[PDB]
Design a protein around this ligand. Structure first.
Ligand SMILES: C[N+](C)(C)CCCN1C(=O)[C@@H]2[C@H](C1=O)[C@H](c1cc(-c3ccc(Cl)s3)on1)N1CCC[C@@H]21
Ligand SMILES: [Ca+2]
Ligand code: NA
Lengths: 54, 233
């Protein structure tokens, strides 16, 4: 599996290992249990437009 | 910003504005965290003293969500060179923390290798600011954004009267009349990846604005990701 196809299915960072991809996330996010998605830990995570009025 | 469009509500929340001795914007910045702003080192020489405004979209309207923050520490790159604008990067630590809210949120710092393989290889990034709306024009009272294509380094160098170092990259258009401009410098160049925006550049310089055969020149943030992390402690 490769980061060059669909970013290894990672929401954010993808890195290749020998025979796999590993996903990771920016500060303020936690990698989901599925190992792919990045879940914000707060209401103003980095890099997200502020579109939901709180 | 020449061309482009006004930033819609909530769409440019990482934009900061450096304001000189009179509450007037002269450069942009990017919010990195509650305490840190990213800007260009050259902006530090454009005003004796300055403060940082966040949350602003219209400089002639006190909307209510804006805040001004004083600067506690200036961290300039120790290799910044005024003649070439090489190493054109600085971080500001604020005296008081930003409260994230509508129109006020940080942009993400990417991991370097992934930024190089995945962000810098995108077709476009986005640049934003309150700068001039044409080369010899006035600053915009409204925050603008603009999608700018990445421009290959070879074409970048040939086009330029000035050296393009490996701490710089080109973005924008050959002849299409859209670019950043004076007053945008220091502000964000971000690249979208699955609805998350990552810092990829700092608006640095150009020869005029939106000139035929010239591009916008940006500080290459991937070269400085380790430097930024150290500067933020
Ligand atoms: C760094 N060096 C190699 C010496 C080139 C400096 C060019 N310089 C100048 O000579 C200044 C300033 C500006 O960059 C400004 C300017 C241009 C821009 C940008 C255009 C595209 C950008 Cl991306 S930033 O931001 N400020 N220009 C418009 C009015 C004056 C002139
Ligand atoms: Ca305002
Ligand atoms: Na051009």
């Amino acid at each position: 599996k490769l980061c060059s196809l669909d970013n290894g299915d990672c929401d954010q960072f993808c890195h290749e290992e020998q025979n796999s991809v590993v996903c990771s996330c920016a500060r303020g996010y936690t990698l989901a249990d599925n190992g792919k998605a990045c879940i914000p830990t707060g209401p103003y995570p980095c890099g997200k437009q502020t579109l939901e009025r709180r | 910003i020449v061309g482009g469009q006004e930033c819609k509500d909530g769409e440019c929340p990482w934009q900061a504005l450096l304001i000189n001795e009179e509450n007037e914007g002269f450069c942009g910045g990017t919010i990195l965290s509650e305490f840190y702003i990213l800007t260009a080192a050259h902006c530090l020489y454009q005003a004796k003293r300055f403060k940082v405004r966040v949350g602003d979209r219209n400089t002639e309207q006190e909307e209510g969500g804006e805040a001004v923050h004083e600067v506690e520490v200036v961290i300039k790159h120790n290799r910044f060179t005024k003649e070439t604008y090489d190493f054109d990067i600085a971080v500001l630590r604020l005296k008081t923390p930003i409260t994230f809210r509508m129109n006020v949120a940080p942009a993400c710092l990417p991991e370097r290798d992934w930024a190089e393989s995945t962000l810098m290889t995108q077709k476009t990034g986005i640049v934003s600011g309150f700068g001039r709306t044409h080369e010899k024009g006035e600053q915009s009272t409204r925050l603008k954004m603009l999608e700018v294509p990445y421009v290959d380094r070879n074409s970048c160098k040939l086009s330029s009267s000035f050296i393009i170092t490996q701490n710089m990259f080109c973005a924008g258009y050959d002849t299409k009349q859209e670019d950043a401009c004076q007053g945008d410098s220091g502000g964000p160049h971000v690249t979208r990846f699955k609805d998350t925006y990552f810092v990829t550049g700092i608006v640095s310089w150009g020869e005029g604005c939106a000139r035929k055969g010239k591009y916008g020149i940006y500080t290459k943030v991937t070269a400085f990701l380790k430097w930024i992390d150290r500067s933020m402690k």
